[PDB]
Amino acid sequence: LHALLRDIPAPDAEAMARTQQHIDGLLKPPGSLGRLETLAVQLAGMPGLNGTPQVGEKAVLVMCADHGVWDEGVAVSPKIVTAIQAANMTRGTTGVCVLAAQAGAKVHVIDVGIDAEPIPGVVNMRVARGCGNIAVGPAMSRLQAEALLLEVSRYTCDLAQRGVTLFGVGELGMANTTPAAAMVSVFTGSDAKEVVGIGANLPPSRIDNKVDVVRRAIAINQPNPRDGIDVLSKVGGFDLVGMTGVMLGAARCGLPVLLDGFLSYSAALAACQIAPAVRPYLIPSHFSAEKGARIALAHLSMEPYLHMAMRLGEGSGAALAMPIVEAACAMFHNMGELAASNIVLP
Amino acid sequence: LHALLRDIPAPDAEAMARTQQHIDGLLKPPGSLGRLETLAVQLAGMPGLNGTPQVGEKAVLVMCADHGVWDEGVAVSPKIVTAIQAANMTRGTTGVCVLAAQAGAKVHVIDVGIDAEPIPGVVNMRVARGCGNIAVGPAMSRLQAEALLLEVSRYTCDLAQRGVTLFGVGELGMANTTPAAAMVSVFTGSDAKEVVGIGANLPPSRIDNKVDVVRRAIAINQPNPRDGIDVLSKVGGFDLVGMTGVMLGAARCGLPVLLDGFLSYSAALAACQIAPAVRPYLIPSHFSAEKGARIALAHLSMEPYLHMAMRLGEGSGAALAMPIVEAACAMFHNMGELAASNIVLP
Ligand SMILES: O=C(O)c1ccc[n+]([C@@H]2O[C@H](COP(=O)([O-])O)[C@@H](O)[C@H]2O)c1
Ligand SMILES: O=C(O)c1ccc[n+]([C@@H]2O[C@H](COP(=O)([O-])O)[C@@H](O)[C@H]2O)c1
Ligand SMILES: Cc1ccc(O)c(N)c1
Ligand SMILES: Cc1ccc(O)c(N)c1
């Protein structure tokens, strides 16, 4: 893992400079396409894209797992929904499946810790049948976290060898907004009350209990904010670790990764803490309706492109933003040039 | 025109109720897809869509015209850029062409008042070679405004008869952010300084002159805020009138219209003033980087889906948001149902 993190490539400033120059010469007032131009330049700096903003195959990786903390009453969804929904993922009937199809992306469902029998058709990387209840102890051991990071990292960069150039990250796990809130609180240093949300329709009353659970998880585990792996293993979950692993793998592969909602933000905070070199490869999609979204994004210094008040998860937001990445590529390669039309602007 | 405005259909509450019920039963926590769900319901209420969120053919109508107020030094772009760019539109090399292609939409370039010889391949509906300089008088007569509204309205609803179910509106005209700022100031009652922006890269110094021009236009013409046609004819332009006409035509046709940037916001304010029944058919795309965008959107009570800091115009933002409308339709029709998976949520 030390090797993996040491080999993450830095962005290519040379390709980025050539990109900027080419964009400024396009048939439009300089900088008029705003964030679409900055996005194109960002992509140009990613070594896996061959010095140019391009999109080949697209894949959304969905990490599924159950959480022990579900027993603390922090989630109203039946625990079996994780297993049932994971199955539905293979049938193409879920939100991310429908949105990924529209974007022409393929969905990879990965079981990293569902508490049920193996689901055929789902990639099997399960660490255990659900992680430990973070309210009374750690979610898993440091070794288990590191191994899963390694495993998912390799799987991710291996897909690149098959044509994939754009990744989307998602998750599925009842009660996972609780460990997500805990991680955000630890990494940003915010009080649990400011970062704990309603998740998948938790009643407004039950919120207090959720906040107490988050506080208890932190107190009992004493996770070290300066060590993202320590935080993940103590108050995270298998699905959160998996998402972090996709981010490290894509970065090592020098390829772009589209974030999704609140759960992915917590995973990205862990990833950037573990390896700052990962940040240049992260691309925001939407602004999650989860309460702690604003704080999490502020520490990641990211401004999402889409404001859809979405809070489904599954990587549905990542899929929805893929057309945007393709649009920046289309602008870059298909627009005409000012000089060719004899247009001169001051 | 009185007939046209009197025949705009009200939204179908019955179809909308059936839509909401169907969405609530989808494979996800109720309301978790946020604005995507509200958008699907909105579309279901539009009589031209056959009681269901659907998208057939897509078209972006680009209204091109020159403005007399260009002579007041409010724009740094050479005036001929309108004519040159209009030509480029027919060659598919402009920003809206590239983005429309990506969304699978067709671009209709309409000349409603370019100050140059006719451009082959462009729809000819020119009122005159540029409109009057709003700084010293009206842009056009009330009759000219009404006729163009009628003309564009019919052209728009006629396209519907050919399969088009989703419209996007755009414009092209050097100096048009000046009359746009004037209209916004009049309709919202905001001071010119709060609504005048840099347009297509106007230097920060020249801003004062632009503000004075806007104030002079209003003072000299004394447009009546309660009469959108009066405002359009006095301190508007041919391109702005044309965009308003697309909105009235789509509404009469009971079909959805995606707005673009700042220029389209001013046209939408005029449209809603002329006929409030038009509002239910308007769909925002992005949040323009133009200074007066916030104020204009607030009076339209709209919250854009995309924050791309774009300010190109041409209808490029409308095209970029088309995939979003298609996504709401895909969600509605392709997602599985909770009941079928035996999932029960409180
Ligand atoms: O992605 C988000 O922003 C998001 C926000 C709120 C809830 N969710 C989803 O709902 C689940 C977590 O909610 P909860 O109440 O069980 O903690 C999980 O399966 C996520 O996919 C996802
Ligand atoms: O759509 C916007 O929000 C937008 C914001 C600023 C500038 N523009 C474009 O630039 C032109 C108006 O800018 P200007 O400086 O000539 O008044 C016109 O041709 C528009 O297409 C468009
Ligand atoms: C080149 C150029 C200058 C100004 C504009 O508004 C556009 N669309 C294009
Ligand atoms: C049905 C259901 C319940 C909770 C969830 O997070 C999802 N995706 C789906």
Swiss-Prot record, chains A, B:
Enzyme type, top EC level: transferase
Signal peptide range: none
SUPFAM superfamilies per record: Nicotinate mononucleotide:5,6-dimethylbenzimidazole phosphoribosyltransferase (CobT)
Transmembrane segments: none
Site (Important for substrate positioning, might be proton acceptor): 171, 314
Gene Ontology MF terms in the entry: nicotinate-nucleotide-dimethylbenzimidazole phosphoribosyltransferase activity; nucleotide binding
UniProt-listed InterPro entries: Nict_dMeBzImd_PRibTrfase (IPR003200), Nict_dMeBzImd_PRibTrfase_bact (IPR017846), Nict_dMeBzImd_PRibTrfase_N (IPR023195), Nict_dMeBzImd_PRibTrfase_sf (IPR036087)
Disruption phenotype: No growth on cobinamide (CBI); double cobB-cobT deletion mutants do not grow on CBI and DMB.
Pathway participation: Nucleoside biosynthesis; alpha-ribazole biosynthesis; alpha-ribazole from 5,6-dimethylbenzimidazole: step 1/2
GO BP terms, alphabetized: cobalamin biosynthetic process
Residues annotated to bind substrate: 85
Phenotype upon changing residue 77 to Y: Alters specificity to use phenolic compounds as substrate
EC number: 2.4.2.21
Keyword annotations from UniProtKB, A to Z: Cobalamin biosynthesis, Glycosyltransferase, Nucleotide-binding, Transferase
Reaction equation(s) it catalyzes: 5,6-dimethylbenzimidazole + nicotinate beta-D-ribonucleotide = alpha-ribazole 5'-phosphate + nicotinate + H(+)
Subunit structure: Homodimer.
Function comment: Catalyzes the synthesis of alpha-ribazole-5'-phosphate from nicotinate mononucleotide (NAMN) and 5,6-dimethylbenzimidazole (DMB). Able to use a variety of other nucleotide bases as substrate to create alternative lower ligands for cobamide.
Family: Belongs to the CobT family.
Extra facts: In vitro assays of this enzyme are performed at pH 10 because at physiological pH (7.0) its activity is undetectable; this makes it difficult to assess the role of mutagenesis of potential proton acceptor active site residues (Glu-171 and Glu-314).
Protein name in UniProt: Nicotinate-nucleotide--dimethylbenzimidazole phosphoribosyltransferase
Species for this entry: Salmonella typhimurium (strain LT2 / SGSC1412 / ATCC 700720)
Originating gene: cobT
